[PDB]
């Protein structure tokens with residue numbers, strides 16, 4: 001079934017607005033077909049109650065069962081120099097089930113902060129689009145950028161993806177942790193220097209196989225491993 | 230270092246051409262600088278013999294060992310209706326170590342075989358840039374298209390990624406099979422019918438956690454898990 005996101009409910013009715021009425025519109029959707037609507041926590045199976053052109057109402061036919069992410073991952077991403085690449089990594093972090101997304105400024109990452117801050121609004125909307133197709137009940141929190149030199153390992157287990165270092169495989173890390181910190185570098189990668197600071201602070205360094213991946217194919221690569229295990 | 234591609238080796242000199250030359254100069258390589266060139270199954274570390282107006286000769290200094298994929302994966306990707314998507318799926322398939330890529334014609338996927346055969350050339354070239362960037366010397370073979378109906382569990386472990394069926398957990402698959410066969414669906418997934426046919430054969434259905442992912446994200450997820458063992 002199709003899925004939409006509503007930010008307002010009255011009694012047992014969810015209301016779509018703006019972008020949603022368009023999305024829902026292009027979707028013909030016979031007068032009474034069941035489509036989902038995630039609202040403040042869960043997703044609700046609904047049938048149209050009345051359709052406009054500016055706003056639409058849906059009636060809750062059933063509390064749909066919504067699963068949560070087995071692990072609480074906080075992906076610390078080094079902002080790619082090509083910000084569009086960050087559009088993917090954000091949508092994807094979302095479908096994969098990442099609870100938190102933190103942009104990082106590293107020696108080789110995009111450097112401007114304001115541009116990163118202004119990119120948030122779009123980071124956010126993309127999350128929404130993603131929790132609709134992904135049917136993800138809750139959102140992915142996008143945070144204010146933090147400097148790579150300020151990271152501290154704080155999760156049950158803490159990883160740093162590095163292709164330059166001869167690290168351990170994911171299997172070797174504590175895959176039985178409930179919360180994780182995962183630091184991925186930009187297109188240019190991590191400087192031998194800055195990653196040494198990290199392994200020293202405690203971030204366990206993982207080496208994926210069998211080649212060098214673009215930063216985004218590396219992100220899903222490991223998140224996939226850390227969420228499915 | 231910088232890795233380039235070559236299909237011309239006159240002597241101990243690996244010649245570069247067309248776009249591979251525009252990249253070389255756009256990289257202002259300083260004389261005696263060290264870079265690599267992939268040729269006939271392996272990468273050689275080379276120092277620039279001389280960048281000609283057209284060609285660009287590269288002197289071989291040492292034949293580097295090639296690191297082959299720990300697993301033998303054959304990807305069966307249902308061509309996505311949005312063909313630009315196959316651009317990234319062929320790419321990521323490549324840097325992940327997938328050996329064979331087979332485009333599939335399924336009920337809810339792209340259909341025009343004629344187009345699939347043509348956009349294939351574009352893909353073969355997306356592979357070379359992916360080999361160069363992922364220091365990958367072994368070529369991913371893109372085969373002629375085939376439809377689901379004709380698929381065969383030719384490999385040891387044969388999987389079918391489906392979000393519609395409560396298949397097995399990724400962690401419970403033969404994570405130590407030598408060869409593999411992964412079948413992924415187009416945007417609309419696999420219909421109960423087609424999947425049930427594939428499962429009807431030896432194809433083991435797998436379910437990823439915890440949400441529904443777009444095809445490209447799933448391709449990465451299943452293979453990132455299998456390759457990193």
Ligand SMILES: Nc1ncnc2c1ncn2[C@@H]1O[C@H](CSCC[C@H](N)C(=O)O)[C@@H](O)[C@H]1O
Pocket residue numbers: 160161162163183184185186187188189190206207208209210211212213214215216218230
């Ligand atoms: N094989 C691998 N194992 C672990 N991490 C990888 C990886 N391949 C890529 N990554 C991740 O992707 C990020 C950017 S890849 C940077 C590659 C570098 N420019 C080079 O020339 O080799 C890396 O910092 C790391 O976080």
Ligand SMILES: Nc1ncnc2c1ncn2[C@@H]1O[C@H](CSCC[C@H](N)C(=O)O)[C@@H](O)[C@H]1O
Pocket residue numbers: 001390391392412413414415416417418419435436437438439440441442443444447
């Ligand atoms: N969680 C998951 N488990 C297994 N396979 C998945 C998956 N999420 C996506 N896929 C793969 O990605 C393909 C396209 S996603 C299909 C989603 C489906 N049309 C829907 O809206 O419900 C699926 O057919 C499957 O091959």
